[PDB]
């Protein structure tokens, strides 16, 4: 639809990704390191919406990593949260084949990357 709708969908995605990031950073746990060591596949280039395939394919492991680290203090509802992230991605990505970087990263770097991605596109749309 309008250029504004894409902008609205991106910030929706952005905020959800930031929710996960901010939740993790403020998380304080002894066995928290288990969640951070896990490697995530990264996009080689994230320039346009079509590159969101790299995020989509990594959504399920993102869910599973978050699901594994679910204590009293850390409650994010991964299944529903990712589903919310997923349906937004599909509205944006809408058969490109994801190309991945050779270097893997942690969940923090993974989140920051796609957070930067949304911000990069939004700034251009404005």
């Amino acid at each position, epitope marked *: 639809s309008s250029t504004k709708k894409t902008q609205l969908q991106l*910030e*929706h995605l*952005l*905020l*959800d990704l*930031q*929710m996960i990031l*901010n*939740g993790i950073n*403020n*998380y304080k746990n002894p066995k928290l390191t288990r969640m951070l060591t896990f490697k995530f596949y990264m996009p080689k280039k994230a320039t346009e919406l079509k590159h969101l395939q790299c995020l989509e394919e990594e959504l399920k492991p993102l869910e599973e990593v978050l*699901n594994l680290a*679910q*204590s*009293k*203090n*850390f*409650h*994010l*509802r*991964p*299944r*529903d*949260l990712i589903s*919310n*992230i997923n349906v937004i991605v599909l509205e944006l990505k809408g058969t490109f084949m994801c190309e991945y970087a050779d270097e893997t990263a942690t969940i923090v770097e993974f989140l920051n990357r796609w957070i930067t991605f949304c911000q990069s596109i939004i700034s251009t749309l404005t």
Partner: antibody, heavy 121, light 111 residues
Framework: QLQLQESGPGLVKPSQTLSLTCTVS??????????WSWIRQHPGKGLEWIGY???????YYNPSLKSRVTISVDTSKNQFSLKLSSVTAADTAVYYC?????????????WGRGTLVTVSS | NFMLTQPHSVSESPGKTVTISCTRS????????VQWYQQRPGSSPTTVIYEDNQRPSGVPDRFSGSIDSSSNSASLTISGLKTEDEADYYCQSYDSSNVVFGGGTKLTVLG
């Protein structure tokens, strides 16, 4: 002081869609620190969670009500609303809007005054 | 998803101590924080206990919360029962699936 106020029709006929709206005053939907929820209570029965929404727009529903509910948020007017489709006499209840922290866990504080919705034709 | 089972009613004379149990049907109850809400008739619920045993400023020290892993339950204990304590009490926890309320318990202060 942060106060929440539910707004509804009070009287709605069965099979219609119930539209509620919560208005945040003395506060705003300006941080990711909270979920914004809807809770209902059938007269003489217990409390039942309906769902809540994040200020991003992402929603989380009760599995038993997921197929009938839809929650939206309006950060500009500091309001969030609920739509409950195809209501019956079983949907007659006092509907509450409430606030709950994110991450730390689900805990509703504060609650709105609650509004009584009577479903009859 | 799970259920929280509370007794329908509990009652004791003023000054005594009463306990309201909250049993979780599925999953460990120590895995999620348990909240306790007090509701007066025709009024909105207020918090007396949040996060298992934490007590909001303004709530009397008579109110205390605990968790029993053995019986998979959560308990609200009120000492020195007062007539103001006469109300409905709801235990509440959460899951990866949804938010779960107890069936509610009517506390009666015997007059």
């Amino acid at each position: 002081q942060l106060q929440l106020q539910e707004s509804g029709p009070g009287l709605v006929k069965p099979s219609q869609t119930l539209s509620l709206t919560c208005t945040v005053s003395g506060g705003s939907i300006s941080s990711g620190g909270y979920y914004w929820s809807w809770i209902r209570q059938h007269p003489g029965k217990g409390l039942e969670w309906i769902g809540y929404i994040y200020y991003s727009g992402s929603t989380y529903y009760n599995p038993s009500l997921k197929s009938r509910v839809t929650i939206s948020v309006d950060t500009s007017k500091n309001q969030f609303s609920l739509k409950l489709s195809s209501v019956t006499a079983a949907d007659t209840a006092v509907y509450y809007c409430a606030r709950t922290p994110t991450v730390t866990g689900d805990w509703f504080d504060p609650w709105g005054r609650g509004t009584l919705v009577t479903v009859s034709s | 998803n799970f259920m929280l089972t509370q007794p329908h009613s509990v009652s004791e004379s003023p000054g005594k101590t009463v306990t309201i149990s909250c049993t979780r049907s599925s999953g460990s109850i120590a895995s999620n924080y348990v909240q306790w809400y007090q509701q007066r008739p025709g009024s909105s619920p207020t918090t007396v206990i949040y996060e298992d045993n934490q007590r909001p400023s303004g709530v009397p020290d008579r109110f205390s919360g605990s968790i029993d892993s053995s019986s998979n339950s959560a308990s609200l204990t009120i000492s020195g029962l007062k007539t103001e304590d006469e109300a409905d009490y709801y235990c509440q926890s959460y899951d990866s699936s949804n938010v779960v309320f107890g069936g509610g318990t009517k506390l009666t202060v015997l007059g």
